[PDB]
Amino acid sequence: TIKCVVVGDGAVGKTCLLISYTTNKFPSEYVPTVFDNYAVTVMIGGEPYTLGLFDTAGQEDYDRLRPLSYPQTDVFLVCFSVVSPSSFENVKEKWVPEITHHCPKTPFLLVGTQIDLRDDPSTIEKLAKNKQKPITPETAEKLARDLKAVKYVECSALTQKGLKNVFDEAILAALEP
Amino acid sequence: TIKCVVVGDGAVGKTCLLISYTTNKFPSEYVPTVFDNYAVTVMIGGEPYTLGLFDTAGQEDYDRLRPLSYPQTDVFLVCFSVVSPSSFENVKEKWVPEITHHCPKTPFLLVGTQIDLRDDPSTIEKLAKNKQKPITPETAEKLARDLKAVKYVECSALTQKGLKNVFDEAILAALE
Amino acid sequence: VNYQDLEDNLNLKGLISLEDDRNANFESNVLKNEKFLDEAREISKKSIPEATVKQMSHLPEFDDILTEGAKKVESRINKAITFRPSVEEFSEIQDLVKTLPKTKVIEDLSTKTNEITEALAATSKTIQRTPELKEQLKTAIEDFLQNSQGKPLTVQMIENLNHGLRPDEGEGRLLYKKENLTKENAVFSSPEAAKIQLAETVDFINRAKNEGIEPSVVGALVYQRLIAYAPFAEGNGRMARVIVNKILLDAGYPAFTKFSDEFEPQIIPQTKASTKSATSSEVVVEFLKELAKKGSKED
Amino acid sequence: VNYQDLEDNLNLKGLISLEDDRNANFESNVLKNEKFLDEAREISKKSIPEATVKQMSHLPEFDDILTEGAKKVESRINKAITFRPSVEEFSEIQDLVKTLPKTKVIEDLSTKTNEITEALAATSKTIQRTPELKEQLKTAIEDFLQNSQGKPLTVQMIENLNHGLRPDEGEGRLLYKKENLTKENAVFSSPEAAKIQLAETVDFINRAKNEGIEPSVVGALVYQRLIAYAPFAEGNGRMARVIVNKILLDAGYPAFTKFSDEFEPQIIPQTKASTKSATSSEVVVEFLKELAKKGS
Ligand SMILES: Nc1nc2c(ncn2[C@@H]2O[C@H](COP(=O)(O)OP(=O)(O)O)[C@@H](O)[C@H]2O)c(=O)[nH]1
Ligand SMILES: Nc1nc2c(ncn2[C@@H]2O[C@H](COP(=O)(O)OP(=O)(O)O)[C@@H](O)[C@H]2O)c(=O)[nH]1
Ligand SMILES: *P(=O)(O)OC[C@H]1O[C@@H](n2cnc3c(N)ncnc32)[C@H](O)[C@@H]1O
Ligand SMILES: *P(=O)(O)OC[C@H]1O[C@@H](n2cnc3c(N)ncnc32)[C@H](O)[C@@H]1O
Ligand SMILES: [Mg+2]
Ligand SMILES: [Mg+2]
């Protein structure tokens, strides 16, 4: 089993991406706050791999509890919504310090989510009215190298775009020194 | 995944043998009536096999529900206690007709359980006083071939004697 | 806050007294309820590796680590729904209620049924385009209205209403939700907490009616908390609106639908940091304003 | 069976009435209780492939298939514990109660604490050899008697009692059991059914005392059903015995320990087909016989 732990702020779409990836369907109704941990078989270059997927609760309420799921993690997924700059800022302020403190040698991916919303007129107009803008791949990739992520990947759980690659890269990160 | 479903009368040790196998420890306290289905990696000839383990409720109350778990079963474990003649008779009267009706063309093993109890002074005293006796491997083997089981195996969840081999045979039965 | 010297013809003071008592016993009834705690304990342990659990088991603070997060969620919800208005709000509510469209002629069961059905449909494209669905919901509403008519509300009536409001589901579905669920950044109660307080909301509805508490305000509070609790796997929104509108139509008030797209996410806590949060009494005020617009030009 | 014209100084008739009403409302309160049903539905679905669940959801019989087994278990348990004696058993119970050792002055709380603690140790080698464990249980017992004395019994007291009787446990354990559990071929109530009927048993303890129903018989019945329901993850045996012995000692009776090794498995339904089954009233009679021996 390769243990993959998904972390990040609330509402960035951690649960939906795990469900979308494991079911091949974007969930449109109710959804667990925390996806029960689930194992899936992934084929990488003819070889089979068992990916163990763990969801987390990102809120401050669970600061003391959440890391108790970190032991023997093989790779982290630090997620932020590309249309939520505050979740992007928390990548640096909260999430990477938290995982490097508990698992300093464990590799991590920087994951942009909900990229379909960069092409959502209502979404951008609402950011602009707040003098904000979506996160670009340029700035995210800068952050990934400044914070020593393995790399930056982005996806949409809704369209499944980039979704498969996220977890392929998660596995490749975990099979390393 | 090779799906293995464990059936048989209540109290034959269906749950305890699954737990003893997966944890390498015989449970001494409370135990689930029905062990939650659990996957395990089993090595046969240097090759990993993924074995899906499914427990059931053996009692008659759950007769209507039980077969609902049978779809895509690869191999059945039909269990009886070697010191329970009634559980052994029900192999023929109930369990193999149940799985052949509700899951045809699916291989099954005949599994004798709690073999440590053939050496238990209290168990054997009781059987003898009721003019009964434990099932010998020989009459079990005969039943197995009569009922077209792949083969007869037996084990003890308490001592783990023969326990590993049971699930080794189950995988072979599913691969043959 | 003291309301003793304020004008009140809605028995708002009796309502506030009722809220004071429930809020006071909230810690004992919910936060310290062992079923709720066990539910939290089991939820928390699922993700924790077996060996870590065992190393934590010797720590005096282990139980609190297991449960603190779940308790903070219920507390945040209770804070959002608990009615404790400012002097000014107390007075504005008094004034706002006099402005409500209110009929004295008592509608009959089929008329109430139709008004509640149309209210449901008003915010639902699916119901509008699907007569089979609309007719099914109408039957459910009619059944609930006829069973609760002249009687104290029971949780059983609600269970049946919720089931009736979930016709497209299939067989063997769970009535209550089995886990913490969310949609659209919403924060709802845990399954056990939602059940406990569903029961309290029923007692509240019955008590409020017996004490002659203004139904338009009762409806507002019930709308907020039933949605915040969301005990069932599905149809919590429909169920809340039917119960609320029974309360309103029985008093001669118009049917409520929803809040605006902007204000609705302010009535319960959200998982989105940016989303604003309204107090219970602010929700009542807004509820009354929306209800007052019901026959208007904007309608 | 009508008991109307039978000799009775134990208010057995009032007790039977109580039981008739609980039994008459059993299907409503337990079998049709939606939380219990949801529990059954979830348990059943765990072993079913999702695609099969999808198929079954189109069939009208699916929900009943889901809930049939769980409901039959609770009915079998309720059948075993519901007190409904024959005329012979009725009369025999009238006789047995008179042979029971019974002090006219009731011992104080500290004396009760000790007798209940000693009764617990009497059937347990582990408590006999481990003074620290025994002393911990003593404290929990004293605490329980302290808070229950002269008050209506509550579910909360029992939760506190159960926890106190589970001392070597570690932190963060579940109080109630989370799944159907068993040991020694036992059949216990489901978690939700056990919770519903723990509350009922509590109310039964309070109602029976108010009606002045013979405490030794109340004790017998409480012993059987609390053990049958077994709501907690652990310590259901110790807990039931402490509660029953509060009931007995309050009336001046001696403490109960256990039934014989041969009779104990008869008092609740078993997963083993060969084990004999005893009716509620047969359990009461045997309980009384065991209790009457305590002096010697
Ligand atoms: N448009 C869009 N919405 C998404 C996507 N992923 C999640 N969401 C929405 O974001 C909200 C919260 O998602 P959730 O998975 O519960 O976030 P979490 O709290 O981090 O687990 C839900 O309303 C989802 O429908 C996405 O890729 N695209
Ligand atoms: N001596 C012995 N006892 C066993 C063995 N397996 C199970 N048991 C006992 O049989 C009883 C019931 O076992 P269980 O697994 O619950 O049977 P099930 O109803 O078929 O699941 C328990 O009290 C166990 O202690 C075994 O291999 N040897
Ligand atoms: P479920 O479909 O049973 O109920 C839907 C109703 O829940 C309320 N609701 C959903 N999402 C939110 C948010 N983010 N904020 C406030 N209220 C919410 C609505 O009343 C739905 O109709
Ligand atoms: P758990 O350890 O909480 O409770 C133990 C008590 O359960 C009763 N008990 C166990 N096993 C059986 C069987 N097979 N039949 C009847 N009663 C049983 C005993 O009272 C234990 O003390
Ligand atoms: Mg989530
Ligand atoms: Mg079992």
Residues of chain C with C-beta less than 8 angstroms from the C-beta of A31? 181-183
Number of domains in chain C: 1
| End-to-end alpha carbon distance in chain B | 15
* 8 A C-beta contact, residue B57 and residue B98: no
Question: Which residue in B29, B65, B84 is closest to D69 by CB distance?
Answer: B65
Asked if D239 and D158 touch (Cβ cutoff 8 Å), the reply is yes
Least Cα distance to C12 among C276, C211, C177 occurs for C211
C237 belongs to an annotated ligand binding site = yes
The DSSP annotation for chain D comes to ---TTS--SS-HHHHHHHHHHHHHTHIIIIIT-HHHHHHHHHHHHTTS-HHHHHHHTTSTTHHHHHHHHHHHHHHHHHHHHS----HHHHHHHHHHHHHS---SSPPPHHHHHHHHHHHHHHT-HHHHH-HHHHHHHHHHHHHHHHHHTTS---HHHHHHHHHHT--SS-SS--SB-SS-EESTTB----HHHHHHHHHHHHHHHHHHHHTT--HHHHHHHHHHHHHHH--BSS-HHHHHHHHHHHHHHHTTPPPP----TTTGGGSS-BSSTTS----HHHHHHHHHHHHHTTT-
Question: Which resolution in angstroms does this entry have?
Answer: 2.3
Q: Which atom of ligand 1 is nearest to the CA of A19?
A: 15
C126, C137, C174, C227, best to mutate for ligand 3 pocket (most atoms within 8 Å of CB): C227
Radius of gyration of chain D (CA): 20
B113 marked as part of a ligand binding site: yes
Phi, psi of A3 (to 5 degrees): -85, 115
Which of C51, C180, C233 lies closest to A33 in CB terms?
C180
In the structure encoding, which two tokens stand for residue C239, read together? 């169920």
Question: Which two structure tokens, joined as six digits, stand for B110?
Answer: 């005949």
**Euclidean distance between CA atoms C218 and C235, whole angstroms:** 21
The answer for residues whose C-beta is within 8 angstroms of residue A173's C-beta and 6 or more apart is: A75, A107, A108, A109, A150
* Residue closest by Cα to atom 9 of ligand 1: A13
Dist. CA B9–CA B16, nearest whole Å:
13
Contact list in C for residue D172 (CB cut-off 8 A) is: 41, 45, 53, 56-57, 62-63, 65-66
CA atoms within 13 A on the CB side of C115: 22
CA distance A41 to chain C (A): 20
The domain in which residue C204 lies consists of 1-299
Rounded Cα distance between C13 and C17, Å, is: 6
The alpha carbons of chain C give a radius of gyration, in whole angstroms, of 20
In sequence order, the 6+-apart residues with CB closer than 8 A to the CB of B71 are B103, D49, D51, D52
Helix axes D62-81, D215-229, angle to 10 degrees: 150
> Which chains, if any, share at least 3 CB pairs under 8 A with chain D?
B, C
Count of structural domains within chain B: 1
Considering only the beta carbons, identify the residue of B68, B86, B87 that sits closest to D48: B68
| Cβ-based contacts of C233 with chain A (< 8 Å) | 30
Taking the alpha carbons at both ends of chain C, their separation in whole angstroms is 36
User: How far, in Å, are A12, A39, B37, D43, D216 from residue B53 at the CA level?
Assistant: 36, 16, 5, 16, 48
Closest by alpha carbon to B84, among B41, B60, B118, B33? B118
Alpha-carbon distance B74 to B105, whole Å? 10
Q: Looking at the CA of A19, which ligand is closest?
A: 1
Please state, in angstroms and rounded to a whole number, the distance separating the CA atoms of residues A97 and A101.
Answer: 6
Q: Are strands A108-113 and B108-113 parallel, antiparallel or unpaired?
A: unpaired
* CA separation for the pair D259, D262 (Å, rounded): 8
- Mutational pocket test of ligand 1: of C47, C73, C185, the residue with most ligand atoms within 8 Å of the beta carbon: C185
Beta-carbon contacts of C118 under 8 Å, excluding residues fewer than 6 positions away, are: C255
Residue C48: which CATH number? 1.10.3290.10
Protein residue with least CA distance to atom 12, ligand 2: B11
How far is D180 from D200, CA to CA, in rounded Å? 20
Q: Is the dihedral of CA A13, A15, A20, A26 positive or negative?
A: negative
Strand duo B47-54 + B38-44: pairing:
antiparallel
B10 and D271 in contact by Cβ < 8 A? yes
Q: Is A13 helix (H, G, I), strand (E, B) or coil?
A: coil
Tokens, residue C52: 């870590």
Taken as a whole, chain B contains a residue count of 176
**Residue D197 in contact with residue D157, Cβ under 8 Å?**
no
**CB of C186 within 8 A of CB of C73?**
no
Evaluate whether C180 touches C64 at the Cβ level (below 8 Å). Answer: no
Distance from the first to the final alpha carbon of chain D: 36
**Which residue shows structure tokens 């149809």?**
C235
Name subunits touching C (3+ CB pairs < 8 A). A, D
Give the burial class of D53: count Cβ atoms within 10 A of its Cβ; 0-12 exposed, 13-18 middle, 19 or more buried: middle
C239 neighbors C161 (Cβ within 8 angstroms) = yes
* Structure-token match 């982005």, residue found: A154
Burial of C203 (0-12, 13-18, 19+ CB in 10 A): middle
Query: What is the secondary structure of C59-89 as a DSSP string?
Result: -TTHHHHHHHHHHHHHHHHHHHH-----HHH
Instruction: Tell the residue nearest (CA) to atom 6 of ligand 4.
Output: D237
For residue D98, the tally of other CB atoms under 10 A from its CB is: 10
In DSSP notation, C162-231 reads HHHT-TTS-SS--SB-SS-EESTTB----HHHHHHHHHHHHHHHHHHHHTT--HHHHHHHHHHHHHHH--
Q: Which residue is it, tokens 């208005």?
A: C85
What ligand has the least distance to the C-alpha of D242?
4
CATH code of residue A148:
3.40.50.300
Tokens standing for residue B117: 């109890």
Buried b (16+ CB within 10 A) or exposed e, C170-189: ebbbbbbbeebbbeebbbbb
Q: How far is CA A122 from CA A10, A118, A119, A136, B138, in A?
A: 21, 10, 9, 18, 77
Q: Give the span between the Cα atoms of B57 and A105, in whole angstroms.
A: 46
Cβ of residue C184 lying under 6 Å from some atom of ligand 1: yes
Of D80, D72, D91, nearest to D31 (Cα)?
Answer: D72
Cα(C98)–Cα(D13) distance, integer angstroms:
60
Placement of tokens 């939906």 in the chain: A16
Burial B8-33 (b: 16+ CB within 10 A, else e): bbbbbbbbbbbbbbeeeebeeebbbb
Distance CA D33, CA D191 (A): 13
To the question of whether residue C14 is assigned a binding role by annotation, the answer is no
Q: Is residue D276 lining ligand 4, measured as CB closer than 6 Å?
A: no
Q: Does an interface of 3+ CB pairs under 8 Å exist between D and B?
A: yes
**Cα separation of A45 and A172, whole Å?**
11
Structure tokens, B49: 């096999």
Q: Would you give the distance in Å from CA D247 to the centre of its chain? A: 13
Contact D176, D231 (CB under 8 A): yes
Amino acid at D54: K
Cα separation, D230 vs D193, in Å, equals 10
Q: Please report the residues numbered 231 through 270 in chain D whose beta carbons come closer than 8 angstroms to any beta carbon of chain B.
A: 233-234, 270
Is residue C34 within 8 Å of D175, Cβ to Cβ? yes
Burial A111-127 (b: 16+ CB within 10 A, else e): bbbbbbbbeeeebbeeb
Query: C34: annotated binding-site residue?
Result: no
CA distance C266 to D251: 59
Q: Give CA–CA dist D140/D55, Å, rounded.
A: 52
Q: Which domain holds residue B108?
A: 1-176
Q: Is C73 on the interface with A (CB under 8 A)?
A: yes
Alpha-carbon gap, residue A46 to A52, rounded angstroms: 19
Q: Which of C162, C182, C184, C266 to mutate to test the pocket of ligand 3 (most atoms within 8 A of CB)?
A: C184
Q: Is the dihedral of CA D29, D32, D35, D37 positive or negative?
A: positive
